[PDB]
């Protein structure tokens, strides 16, 4: 018997989402990037519904809800990719039907970024990150996104406390062998934030270059 | 009482002053020039401070420089933040160089300084103590995530030694909040984010050659 928040978060996990790359269209960076952006777009739609399932989130004002999502969507997407890539080696599982190896990365111009994301994967691998910890870290990442536009700081901190508490309690009961596992999990957040920032900046140097824009 | 924390306390370098020059009329170039020179001198002191962190100088000199290379700005920023806790909407880069909103606009540092203040705000609300400050500073260095680390295991060991010290300190001094250590650790992402913005601003200024950069250049 362990944490109810954690079990609930496991139950609230979105069903698999597919990239669905178009076979008819020949491989090319514009293709890969176009595919990754459509996938992300569809995942973002899902993240909004998913967020309603987070204990303590729906009680925030709509403005604060949007501010948190706006600041943490990339961290949430990246964590997902990372968790799906744990049983793999030097490959990123953006989706079951879209797994990127080194060559597919070079061919898309995502070598640097994908290598940075692989660094997150590596750290979580060594720790043997569990699905329970993964879902709790996603919610924590959302609550701890540090938006400068928050209207109700106290309420946001309460969301953080509730999820932080769930993690600490889960670790206390399932990993008594390492009394600092909760802390180690929290210490992975800086790299997540850092990697998300590099991804966002990348998504701009291309949306910008007229890569696959209109935006 | 905690040994690691006590040691970090006495290992604190003493104050470094900015020493702004009056023969020079205030401008943006003056502010940037001043801040860069201040950072340069703080960096010399930081390198020596790191050698006193338990298990640090014992790492390969490569790993040693790797952690510093990835964490120097976070360490600089945490200092400014800590020194600014007692103030309001002001940044104490040094006792003789306190920047308010007006000065930030003049140096073209309004957005960066506002971001740094966001960090001050969080720590002010938590009532960050000196003991927690020095410990987080050491943790920021050890948890800097350099992509060049040779001995990962040893670096993780260093993180664990500092983390245990923080966890132990919070258990004794703050049994009132059984989650204080975790909350301290949760401020690290904002520290990384703000430092990244600082570094980006810094290298853009260099790229633009906006500041008369010596140093052998
Ligand atoms: C790194 C690819 C990516 C994105 C986000 C749309 C991207 C696309 C193009 C770029 O130039 C940079 C990042 C992404 C897609 C789905 C996820 O679950 C997580 C990340
Ligand atoms: C944010 C100003 C700054 C720097 C350090 C070089 C700076 C200067 C000019 C820039 O364009 C960007 C950053 C700094 C100085 C002392 C500290 O303890 C911490 C940070």
Mark yes or no for CB contact A187/B159 under 8 Å: yes
> Which SS3 state, helix, strand or coil, does residue B4 take?
helix
CA angle A167, A173, A178 (to 5 degrees): 85
Closest CA to B140 of B91, B89, B185: B185
Experimental method: X-ray
> Which SS3 state, helix, strand or coil, does residue B83 take?
helix
Sign of CA dihedral B99, B101, B103, B106: positive
C-alpha span between B2 and B172 (Å, rounded): 9
CB of B171 closer than 8 Å to CB of B79: no
Mark yes or no for CB contact B192/A192 under 8 Å: no
| Cα–ligand 2 centroid distance for B36 (angstroms) | 6
Q: Of B125, B182, B196, which has the smallest distance from its Cβ to A186's Cβ?
A: B182
> Which residues have C-beta within 8 Å of that of residue A20, sequence separation ≥ 6?
A35, A38, A97
Tokens of B197: 């913005």
Ligand 1: nearest atom to the Cα of A37: 6
Closest CA to B80 of B44, B123, B48: B123
Residue with token string 């860069």: B36
Exposure of A100 by Cβ count < 10 A (0-12 exposed, 13-18 middle, 19+ buried)? buried
Closest CA to A197 of B84, B199, B71, B167: B199
Tokens of A37: 């952006």
C-alpha span between A179 and A158 (Å, rounded): 24
Tokens of B163: 């983390």
C-alpha span between A84 and A208 (Å, rounded): 29
C-alpha span between A203 and A215 (Å, rounded): 11
> Which SS3 state, helix, strand or coil, does residue A207 take?
helix
Q: Of B145, B160, B193, which has the smallest distance from its Cβ to A146's Cβ?
A: B193
Residue with token string 């303590």: A56
Residue B94, strand partner residues: B97
Q: Which helix (H) or strand (E) holds B99?
A: strand B97-99
Write out the CATH class of domain B1-217. Answer: mainly alpha
Closest CA to A141 of A211, A76, A56, A206: A76
Closest CA to B191 of A194, A199, A183, A150: A194
Closest CA to A20 of A1, A6, A5, A41: A41
C-alpha span between A112 and A116 (Å, rounded): 6
Instruction: Compute how many other C-beta atoms are within 10 angstroms of the C-beta atom of residue B169.
Output: 22
Domain A1-215 has CATH 1.10.565.10: yes
Exposure of B10 by Cβ count < 10 A (0-12 exposed, 13-18 middle, 19+ buried)? exposed
Q: Which residues of A touch B196 (CB under 8 A)?
A: 194, 197
Query: Which among A157, A177, A183 is the top mutation candidate for probing chain B, defined by the most B β-carbons within 10 Å of its own β-carbon?
Result: A183
Closest CA to A134 of A54, A177, A76, A187: A76
Measured in angstroms, the resolution is 2.1
C-alpha span between A87 and B120 (Å, rounded): 40
C-alpha span between A51 and B188 (Å, rounded): 24
Instruction: Compute how many other C-beta atoms are within 10 angstroms of the C-beta atom of residue B94.
Output: 22
Cβ(A19) – ligand 1 distance below 6 Å:
no
């Amino acid at each position: 018997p362990y944490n109810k928040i954690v079990s609930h978060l496991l139950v609230a996990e979105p069903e698999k989402i597919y990239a669905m790359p178009d076979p008819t269209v020949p491989d090319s960076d514009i293709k890969a990037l176009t595919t990754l952006c459509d996938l992300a777009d569809r995942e973002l739609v899902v993240i909004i519904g998913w967020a309603k399932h987070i204990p303590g989130f729906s009680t925030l004002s709509l403005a604060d809800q949007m501010s948190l999502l706006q600041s943490a969507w990339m961290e949430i997407l990246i964590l997902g990719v990372v968790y799906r890539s744990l049983s793999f080696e030097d490959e990123l599982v953006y989706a079951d039907d879209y797994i990127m190896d080194e060559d597919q990365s070079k061919l898309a111009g995502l070598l640097d970024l994908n290598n940075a994301i692989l660094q997150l994967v590596k750290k979580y691998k060594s720790m043997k990150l569990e699905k329970e910890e993964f879902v709790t870290l996603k919610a924590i990442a959302l609550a701890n996104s540090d938006s400068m536009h928050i209207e109700d700081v106290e309420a946001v901190q309460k969301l953080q406390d509730v999820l932080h508490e769930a993690l600490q309690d889960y670790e206390a009961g399932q990993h008594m062998e390492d009394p600092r596992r909760a802390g180690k999990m929290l210490m992975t957040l800086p790299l997540l934030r850092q990697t998300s920032t590099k991804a966002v900046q990348h998504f701009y140097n291309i949306k910008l270059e007229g890569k696959v824009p209109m935006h």
